Scaffold this active site. Structure first.
Site, mmCIF file in Angstrom:
data_model
loop_
_atom_site.group_PDB
_atom_site.id
_atom_site.type_symbol
_atom_site.label_atom_id
_atom_site.label_comp_id
_atom_site.label_asym_id
_atom_site.label_seq_id
_atom_site.Cartn_x
_atom_site.Cartn_y
_atom_site.Cartn_z
ATOM 1 N N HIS A 1 55.389 5.656 29.059
ATOM 2 C CA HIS A 1 56.615 6.231 29.608
ATOM 3 C C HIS A 1 56.685 7.748 29.464
ATOM 4 C CE1 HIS A 1 57.642 1.975 29.266
ATOM 5 N NE2 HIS A 1 57.334 2.068 27.985
ATOM 6 N N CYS B 1 65.644 0.094 19.861
ATOM 7 C CA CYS B 1 66.482 -0.709 20.745
ATOM 8 C C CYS B 1 67.922 -0.757 20.256
ATOM 9 C CB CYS B 1 65.916 -2.124 20.869
ATOM 10 S SG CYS B 1 64.308 -2.218 21.701
ATOM 11 N N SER C 1 52.952 7.391 33.709
ATOM 12 C CA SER C 1 53.922 6.526 33.060
ATOM 13 C C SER C 1 53.533 5.069 33.268
ATOM 14 C CB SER C 1 55.328 6.775 33.603
ATOM 15 O OG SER C 1 56.289 6.057 32.847
ATOM 16 N N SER D 1 56.209 5.984 15.791
ATOM 17 C CA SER D 1 55.260 5.369 16.715
ATOM 18 C C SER D 1 54.163 6.346 17.116
ATOM 19 C CB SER D 1 55.991 4.867 17.959
ATOM 20 O OG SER D 1 57.070 4.029 17.604
ATOM 21 N N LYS E 1 56.081 1.534 13.045
ATOM 22 C CA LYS E 1 56.247 1.291 14.475
ATOM 23 C C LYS E 1 57.077 0.031 14.688
ATOM 24 C CE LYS E 1 55.696 0.681 18.945
ATOM 25 N NZ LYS E 1 56.181 -0.477 19.751
ATOM 26 N N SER F 1 60.770 4.658 33.902
ATOM 27 C CA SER F 1 60.944 5.177 32.551
ATOM 28 C C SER F 1 60.712 6.676 32.434
ATOM 29 C CB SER F 1 60.011 4.447 31.586
ATOM 30 O OG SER F 1 58.655 4.634 31.950
ATOM 31 N N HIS G 1 58.986 -5.781 27.780
ATOM 32 C CA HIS G 1 58.143 -4.799 28.462
ATOM 33 C C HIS G 1 58.055 -5.034 29.969
ATOM 34 C CE1 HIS G 1 55.001 -1.874 29.183
ATOM 35 N NE2 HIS G 1 54.321 -2.814 29.816
ATOM 36 N N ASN H 1 51.241 -1.071 17.407
ATOM 37 C CA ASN H 1 52.560 -1.689 17.315
ATOM 38 C C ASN H 1 52.833 -2.225 15.914
ATOM 39 O OD1 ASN H 1 55.019 -2.902 18.938
ATOM 40 N ND2 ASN H 1 54.207 -4.587 17.688
ATOM 41 N N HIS I 1 64.077 5.290 23.286
ATOM 42 C CA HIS I 1 64.308 5.561 21.873
ATOM 43 C C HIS I 1 64.440 7.063 21.622
ATOM 44 C CE1 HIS I 1 63.366 1.483 21.852
ATOM 45 N NE2 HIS I 1 62.225 1.465 21.186
ATOM 46 N N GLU J 1 50.342 0.536 22.416
ATOM 47 C CA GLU J 1 51.648 0.869 21.862
ATOM 48 C C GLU J 1 52.486 -0.367 21.556
ATOM 49 O OE1 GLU J 1 52.861 3.784 21.053
ATOM 50 O OE2 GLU J 1 55.013 3.419 20.860
ATOM 51 N N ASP K 1 60.408 1.424 15.518
ATOM 52 C CA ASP K 1 60.531 1.561 16.966
ATOM 53 C C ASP K 1 61.194 0.334 17.584
ATOM 54 O OD1 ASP K 1 59.671 1.001 19.756
ATOM 55 O OD2 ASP K 1 58.423 2.792 19.586
ATOM 56 N N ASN K 2 60.556 -0.831 17.442
ATOM 57 C CA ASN K 2 60.996 -2.015 18.173
ATOM 58 C C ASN K 2 62.421 -2.403 17.801
ATOM 59 O OD1 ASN K 2 58.195 -1.658 18.131
ATOM 60 N ND2 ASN K 2 57.781 -3.827 18.522
ATOM 61 N N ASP L 1 50.242 1.454 26.916
ATOM 62 C CA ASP L 1 51.539 0.884 26.554
ATOM 63 C C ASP L 1 51.787 -0.265 27.525
ATOM 64 O OD1 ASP L 1 54.236 0.194 26.165
ATOM 65 O OD2 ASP L 1 54.820 2.249 25.725
ATOM 66 N N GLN M 1 50.155 6.794 16.805
ATOM 67 C CA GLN M 1 49.276 6.941 17.964
ATOM 68 C C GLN M 1 48.238 8.032 17.735
ATOM 69 O OE1 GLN M 1 48.490 5.327 20.427
ATOM 70 N NE2 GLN M 1 50.179 4.125 21.297
HETATM 71 N N1 LIG Z 1 61.953 -1.441 25.527
HETATM 72 C C1 LIG Z 1 61.503 -1.048 24.347
HETATM 73 O O1 LIG Z 1 61.768 0.062 23.874
HETATM 74 C C2 LIG Z 1 60.558 -1.961 23.614
HETATM 75 C C3 LIG Z 1 60.138 -1.675 22.320
HETATM 76 C C4 LIG Z 1 59.239 -2.511 21.685
HETATM 77 C C5 LIG Z 1 58.781 -3.629 22.336
HETATM 78 N N2 LIG Z 1 59.226 -3.912 23.576
HETATM 79 C C6 LIG Z 1 58.801 -5.162 24.248
HETATM 80 O O2 LIG Z 1 59.736 -6.164 23.950
HETATM 81 C C7 LIG Z 1 59.069 -7.446 23.879
HETATM 82 C C8 LIG Z 1 59.364 -8.102 22.553
HETATM 83 O O3 LIG Z 1 58.775 -7.296 21.512
HETATM 84 P P1 LIG Z 1 58.985 -7.651 19.975
HETATM 85 O O4 LIG Z 1 58.343 -6.582 19.179
HETATM 86 O O5 LIG Z 1 60.406 -7.982 19.719
HETATM 87 O O6 LIG Z 1 58.122 -8.989 19.836
HETATM 88 P P2 LIG Z 1 58.326 -10.216 18.840
HETATM 89 O O7 LIG Z 1 57.101 -11.134 18.876
HETATM 90 O O8 LIG Z 1 58.581 -9.701 17.475
HETATM 91 O O9 LIG Z 1 59.622 -10.989 19.418
HETATM 92 C C9 LIG Z 1 59.655 -11.781 20.619
HETATM 93 C C10 LIG Z 1 60.476 -12.994 20.270
HETATM 94 O O10 LIG Z 1 60.837 -13.714 21.466
HETATM 95 C C11 LIG Z 1 60.960 -15.069 21.110
HETATM 96 N N3 LIG Z 1 60.921 -15.877 22.323
HETATM 97 C C12 LIG Z 1 59.837 -16.136 23.120
HETATM 98 N N4 LIG Z 1 60.097 -16.917 24.140
HETATM 99 C C13 LIG Z 1 61.450 -17.192 24.006
HETATM 100 C C14 LIG Z 1 62.341 -17.966 24.772
HETATM 101 N N5 LIG Z 1 61.990 -18.633 25.875
HETATM 102 N N6 LIG Z 1 63.628 -18.027 24.367
HETATM 103 C C15 LIG Z 1 63.990 -17.352 23.272
HETATM 104 N N7 LIG Z 1 63.241 -16.591 22.471
HETATM 105 C C16 LIG Z 1 61.972 -16.554 22.893
HETATM 106 C C17 LIG Z 1 59.815 -15.322 20.134
HETATM 107 O O11 LIG Z 1 60.077 -16.434 19.285
HETATM 108 C C18 LIG Z 1 59.772 -14.001 19.348
HETATM 109 O O12 LIG Z 1 60.424 -14.087 18.086
HETATM 110 C C19 LIG Z 1 57.589 -7.170 24.153
HETATM 111 O O13 LIG Z 1 57.291 -7.402 25.525
HETATM 112 C C20 LIG Z 1 57.448 -5.692 23.788
HETATM 113 O O14 LIG Z 1 56.376 -5.081 24.496
HETATM 114 C C21 LIG Z 1 60.092 -3.110 24.222
HETATM 115 K K LIG Z 2 64.975 9.463 24.249
#
Ligand SMILES: NC(=O)c1ccc[n+]([C@@H]2O[C@H](COP(=O)([O-])OP(=O)(O)OC[C@H]3O[C@@H](n4cnc5c(N)ncnc54)[C@H](O)[C@@H]3O)[C@@H](O)[C@H]2O)c1
Ligand SMILES: [K+]
Ligand SMILES: NC(=O)c1ccc[n+]([C@@H]2O[C@H](COP(=O)([O-])OP(=O)(O)OC[C@H]3O[C@@H](n4cnc5c(N)ncnc54)[C@H](O)[C@@H]3O)[C@@H](O)[C@H]2O)c1
Ligand SMILES: NC(=O)c1ccc[n+]([C@@H]2O[C@H](COP(=O)([O-])OP(=O)(O)OC[C@H]3O[C@@H](n4cnc5c(N)ncnc54)[C@H](O)[C@@H]3O)[C@@H](O)[C@H]2O)c1
Ligand SMILES: NC(=O)c1ccc[n+]([C@@H]2O[C@H](COP(=O)([O-])OP(=O)(O)OC[C@H]3O[C@@H](n4cnc5c(N)ncnc54)[C@H](O)[C@@H]3O)[C@@H](O)[C@H]2O)c1
Ligand SMILES: Nc1ncnc2c1ncn2[C@@H]1O[C@H](CO)[C@@H](O)[C@H]1O
Ligand SMILES: [Br-]
Ligand SMILES: [K+]
Ligand SMILES: [K+]
Ligand SMILES: [K+]
Lengths: 460, 461, 461, 461
Positions: free
Chosen positions: D53, D195, D76, D382, D186, D81, D315, D181, D374, D156, D190-191, D131, D386
């Site tokens: 991004h 959020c 990106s 994060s 991170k 993003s 994602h 990650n 973020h 990432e 981050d996650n 990413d 990297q």
């Molecule tokens: N937008 C952002 O800033 C950002 C940041 C980090 C990660 N992400 C993305 O967000 C997603 C999740 O990342 P994460 O670190 O939380 O992963 P994670 O593995 O820690 O969490 C995902 C969760 O979803 C649950 N899950 C799966 N299928 C499900 C369903 N059908 N119903 C309910 N729950 C379900 C799993 O049990 C798991 O606990 C990834 O795709 C990651 O790339 C986005």
């Molecule tokens: K920002």
């Protein structure tokens, strides 16, 4: 149609789309519109309006119009207008003079364009004000217009205090309604609105992480309470300053350390009285007081490097921005976001580390750097505005004999029963289910099943 | 030897005195009055009938009144609220006190009468301190000649204030009163934050139940309902709120709670059919906070989830229809003030029955029944108002006023905001908080005096 | 008809039984194992030495092991942690238990000895359930022959697991062990949410102090430190956090806490000049959660604000330098497990002295010492893991294996994630939670089985 | 005359430069790497393909890599993003960047191809920063000859790591990777907290909806689900959580959330009857956080409360069935990245229709699509990881290793905990936090070095 001035009229369709969404978020306001449109209670009303030209104010405007009123509107702040809202209002054939980013001269000009129609004073008979600017201008510059005005409805704490000062001095020429002190306003708008919109504006202006950082909130009234929660819920370490020991007690019990910018709380005007150790670790200062010079020059000089400074009180003199303009160099990051370099007045280094970030040039940050309160919160405030406008227009103060006028020249709040009826529609908007008292229970506590449920002394 | 008292165990006095000594360090506003007024003796000659929960905090209040010159005769205004070590310590100081934890209703009335009578005759009382109005009503119904010589009542709680106001509008109130409850440093401190501290405290002591992740229903969202809701929410409960006041209901919504009614569409139709069975079948804990009657009724109790905990933190036990449960269901005492109510029958119960509720404190105020009530540093605000109110009403000498002068002063009033602010300042200083002092230019700008008061009387905080 | 026990009061057994019957309804994972493995009797022939806090929750754990066919001999692994009504109910059920609240150190070692020895000579134990490693160490250093007949150890807490790892590292561990602590339904449930529930609980019962508005310093921000900080912050304390781990300190910052050190720049040189006296002079409450030694040392205790509360919720009491305070300052017992430490001298104190600290549980586990520890629904996860671990190690029959096979099985490991998820599922069901089931497409998309496990072993939750 | 870029508006460079300078003061771990490594130039000769991004935070990351001697070509990794002022400031610095907010899917692939190709021919890249794995897969499927000379990938996000692990399992991964990650600074920064910050941020900017008092349903409770739930709950939303992992579901319960499934009993049999219409009929806001496919399906969309907001912060956009909404319902754009989806038909709609949903960012990453993602101080962790991962993989020189050595290093691994701790320490100092240093006795007591690492690799924090 030409009797308007907005930044870009082609934003009207966007504003209309957001007005249509806002109507679904304002059930108390739309409940009044549906209930009263058929009987046209504001038929014959000519309303001078001065309040932030936002999407929410647009729904308020069209509600007054749907009830039969003509209005001439302006924003009562230079940064608070939403241009798409102003454009949609102008596109509907409503006289509006407002845009985001006004100058102080353009600000006065806009108010004059509501007071004047076709170069002559408009034949207004009602006033809706936010802060008292339109109220003061009519009293001092167009006092003959007040002879045909039936009342004023004031939105905010500061405007109400100004109205009370004029009443105490016998200079108030028309009665007013304290919209602010409805509980569905003060204990909704002032608190939860700033809770929603303070961290909102800070994020939009700076995108600063707030969690884990040190904030100082000046004031712990309704705005200070909501502001402090806006920061605390984000995980900030919030310290609160206050001059009211009762409000300070609440901050303590709410889990905040109560501190003063001055040693022992005594401001002797000197730098020696500044608690430099305290201010030197504050990342963000927010003024919420409605008072003057509560973030003074010496505090600004002692603040931690790169601290954010903003005001969410009504007027910008809470912060001594005049000192910062005279002594420090301003670097505009983007609109309503300025770095204030404390290295001097004549020139800054683009990579200087000793600066402060001032939001909205000291004006209301929530409206300056974001969109102010959300529709579902402003729903309560603006339902009171409609009810207050209806009440005073029905009383017809300006047409009464002088003996009757003196009997009802005052500053009143709406009756509690109406306050509760606004609250009920808000609660229904959330899907909430209020319980109906049984006759036995109502008798047991001395109220009606229909309400009012509390005595006028109750503070909620 | 001193014998004009009745407590559970006088040998608890030493333990009570140790906790009284700690409590003094937690009540700076109360002890600040004790230091400011000790020399003047403003209550010299005051004979105070006191009816309020005989806790450690009440002990510090009692000894402050005595330190200011007053004599008292004390009882608890609830059958379960006495801390026995606090009562013993007060009795050990030679102060007449009649209170113990776990009184019968008979003994409760006896105790209030032992304060009213001394050596079998009416005590020469001239001041009343009450919590809930029980002592006030007994004097008005049974000892009207004593009220002739009583200068006033200082009433602690919301329910007592309502009873006083009902007597005033009926013309049956014989002496003026001070609404201590509606000081901000009381109502918006004691009622709210005190219940925030002590509600989950009482539930943990009584049941040791985990609260996080479970479903709660708080009936009422006044000051007690606000504090009670936070007490459960901060523990991680999923809290729903019931209200008849839509303004308070609006606050609950904005505070993050779902606003529900135990009745379908909020309407009680007098039958079980109007009960929202789906809602109540998911509730693990119900707390009544209304000061109203029968807000947790028999049909609600029938529909509650199995093993739900039922308790009340309003002043009186009739918020819950415990009479129904006594009549219809079998009670099993787990421990004092903790009862399993088996909904399977009246006669007996299977020891492993699953269809029971857990009632705390038999429906009496749960924070004082199952724990110790509000902490000292919070009661400091309430009892600083009580002392100030006792001084003001005693100095007025209403009982000595002519009839025409009494009529000009027969009222139920609050303390002036300036005293409310001076109480808050000592509380703030107790936390180490530093209040800012306005500049002369700032005081002029907002139209107040530098020393206060800082708000108009209409201000709601 | 039983005498092979030692408790405080056997007449409390009826009370304990009533609370055990309640706790069974609060522990669905544990009771789920009791229902599942009942007719199978997987612990038939098992003789378990147990050393863990004799609470109500341990009672359901004990009775679950017995219901699965095991014989046990039980002691508490802390002098202040026994619930006497729990110990009485276990004794009344015919199970040898040696535990009471308020043991001396010698009485503590006697109780562990009474489980090790039956009728004068060592019991023929073959399983060990431990919490802290005290029973484990006594067996290794004082009864090594009995480890030849023991199939394994199931260790409850973080400190005990650490002690098991050094034994494994130094080659002195004689039987394999299961790290029960590091199940997610343990460490990330028990250690964190248990202390969240029971820390402010214990402080309230011991002192009845208001927490809101006051200053707390939590030493440590591990699982216990995280839950403790939340326990205080949710009550409205201004919580500062100390840590030696920068990652845990990072979490403390993001969670909204100011990260501080009792020593200037974090450097403790043993001198009083290194104490951040300005910081410690503002602290109303210090809580140690580290599992380390002397993290609240003598100079910190000297610099603490007057009347500050000092308590420890890590496993061993040497986190605070209570030995210094015993040697130099005067101890006043307010009530059991609540002492005022008067810093004015050693051989006496003014009854009204203001320069004291309040020490809870004499530095021992404050949540267990001054309250009842974790609630049943939280301990349900830990003890469901304990039962599964006991079943697994007993079925492995280590002591019956050839010396070659023993060498391949001598380790300290955790239960498989699948079992961790099955415990978690029963806990969620206990809350009424509804877990979603993956579709075949979804399970394939994220590469897991529909039944689980759902996370790789590296996942941290 | 630098023309090797494509941004929306190069005149936004001055504004983007101002925010980059601000962001530098908010990223002390990233700027600490600059100062420590500038003279060493550890990335001299590195040529990094970057797909992440194009935000202000990424700009600081990019310029750190360049400051350490790297050349990059950037795009990106999402069509919405990019911050155009960030992209403009990077291009004005002479850095090849191909990114703008609001790309079409075709322009997205074109932008990635513009980084891969220089002057129509494959760039001499030797490092990859990715990413989500989009850039990684394009190289593996379309430019495998470039992978021969690439030393590693630094991924990432959770989804990208899963794709890498699948290629490693199947033997199709051609270069080693660092799982950035799963650093604690991170994943658990981050996650979660990112959020927390940016979810309600994005919803406010897109809709300006009040969140307090409304119903939210968060699908998933991993790190993103945990942070998303807090983002909404701290605003006063009534948040319900869905999960397929019972362990994460347990945390949701303990964290104070009701755990529900969109399907009756959590079983999606495909049919419309399995939808819990009563639950979905009350939801004002649904947020997908799973990284899974179709967790907010067409039937859930058909049953959602009118005017509900629908968004995804996982994602990829396929978490919500937006393709169904494109086939069946009318899309009215409110403003960029905010669409009303009218459920009243596909062709046309009434401007005052009330049966619509509000989809944010057309189902793409809502925090980056409708706000700025973020904040700098969170991305600092994060992106410090990297940079460290780039230095590590570049110094390993995998592409130059013989076939036998390559096979011993072809893996997907995380950075060592010591580096994780050193990132956290700088983050903690950025807040003004003071980490305590262990005494030699303390470090020996818990068996760690004074310098760290302070936890075993099994520790979950
Ligand atoms: N937008 C952002 O800033 C950002 C940041 C980090 C990660 N992400 C993305 O967000 C997603 C999740 O990342 P994460 O670190 O939380 O992963 P994670 O593995 O820690 O969490 C995902 C969760 O979803 C649950 N899950 C799966 N299928 C499900 C369903 N059908 N119903 C309910 N729950 C379900 C799993 O049990 C798991 O606990 C990834 O795709 C990651 O790339 C986005
Ligand atoms: K920002
Ligand atoms: N921006 C918004 O959305 C918004 C909304 C409502 C009101 N307002 C404005 O915000 C201001 C505050 O309104 P309010 O309703 O909170 O009023 P309030 O009376 O409830 O609170 C103001 C507080 O400031 C305190 N204060 C005064 N001088 C101080 C000083 N020198 N240092 C510290 N504290 C000091 C007072 O003790 C008081 O508690 C007014 O100007 C009002 O018009 C803004
Ligand atoms: N136990 C304690 O420590 C303690 C402390 C203070 C007050 N109290 C008692 O608690 C009670 C409440 O005190 P308060 O100050 O909160 O009063 P309050 O007037 O501020 O609140 C009572 C609330 O109950 C609501 N209510 C009434 N009938 C209801 C019904 N049927 N369903 C739902 N809500 C209903 C009312 O709308 C009102 O908002 C009083 O009896 C008071 O004496 C107890
Ligand atoms: N009382 C209870 O109910 C209960 C429950 C579980 C565990 N425990 C005990 O609590 C202790 C902690 O357990 P845990 O699971 O949280 O362990 P943990 O490893 O997860 O965390 C301990 C933390 O203390 C920190 N620390 C160590 N020395 C320090 C020092 N000098 N200053 C500051 N911080 C320091 C470490 O960096 C670490 O983050 C153990 O002894 C465990 O047995 C008690
Ligand atoms: N610990 C306590 N000691 C004395 N009175 C208390 C205590 N806790 C609550 N109360 C009072 O009891 C009243 C309710 O009967 C409330 O008004 C409150 O002020
Ligand atoms: Br009735
Ligand atoms: K708005
Ligand atoms: K108490
Ligand atoms: K317990």
């Amino acid at each position: 149609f030409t009797d308007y001035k907005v930044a870009d009229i082609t934003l009207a369709a966007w504003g209309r789309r957001e007005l249509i969404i806002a109507e679904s978020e304002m059930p108390a306001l739309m409940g009044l519109r549906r209930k009263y449109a058929g009987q046209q209670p504001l038929k014959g009303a000519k309303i001078l309006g001065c309040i932030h030209m936002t999407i929410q104010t647009g729904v308020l405007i069209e509600t007054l119009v749907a009830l039969g009123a003509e209005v001439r509107w302006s924003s009562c702040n230079i940064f608070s207008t939403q241009d798409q809202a102003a454009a949609a209002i102008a596109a509907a054939g409503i006289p509006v003079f407002a845009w985001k980013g006004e100058t102080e001269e353009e600000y006065e000009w806009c108010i004059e364009q509501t007071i004047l129609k076709d170069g002559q004073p408009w034949d207004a008979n009602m006033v809706l004000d936010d802060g008292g600017d339109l109220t003061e201008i009519l009293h001092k510059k167009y006092p003959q217009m007040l002879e045909r005005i039936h009342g004023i409805t004031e939105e905010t704490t500061t405007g109400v205090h100004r109205l009370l000062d004029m009443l105490k001095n016998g200079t108030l020429k028309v009665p007013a309604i304290n919209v602010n002190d409805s509980v569905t306003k003060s204990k909704n708008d002032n608190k939860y609105g700033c809770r929603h919109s303070l961290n909102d504006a800070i994020k939009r202006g700076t995108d600063h992480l707030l969690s884990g950082k040190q904030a100082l909130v000046i004031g712990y009234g309704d705005v200070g309470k909501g502001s402090s929660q806006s920061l605390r819920q984000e995980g900030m370490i919030v310290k609160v300053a206050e001059v009211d020991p009762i409000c300070a007690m609440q901050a303590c019990m709410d889990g905040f350390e109560v501190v003063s910018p001055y040693k022992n709380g005594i401001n002797d005007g000197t730098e020696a009285s500044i608690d430099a150790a305290l201010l030197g670790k504050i990342d963000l200062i927010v003024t919420t007081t409605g008072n003057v010079n509560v973030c003074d020059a010496n505090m600004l000089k002692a603040l931690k490097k790169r601290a954010v400074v903003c005001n969410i009180g009504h007027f910008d003199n809470e912060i001594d921005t005049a000192f910062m303009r005279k002594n420090w160099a301003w670097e505009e990051v983007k609109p309503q976001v300025h770095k204030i370099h404390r290295t001097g007045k004549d020139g800054f280094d683009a990579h200087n580390d000793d600066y402060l970030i001032l939001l909205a040039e000291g004006r209301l940050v929530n409206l300056g750097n974001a969109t102010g309160h959300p529709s579902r919160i402003m729903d309560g405030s603006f339902a009171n505005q409609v009810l207050a406008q209806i009440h005073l227009f029905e009383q017809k103060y300006a047409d009464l004999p002088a003996a009757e006028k003196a009997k009802r020249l005052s500053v009143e709040v709406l009756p509690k029963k109406l306050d509760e009826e606004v609250a009920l529609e808000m609660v229904k908007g959330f899907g909430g289910v209020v319980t109906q008292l049984t006759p036995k229970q109502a008798e047991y506590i001395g109220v009606s099943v229909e309400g009012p449920f509390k005595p006028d002394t109750y503070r909620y």
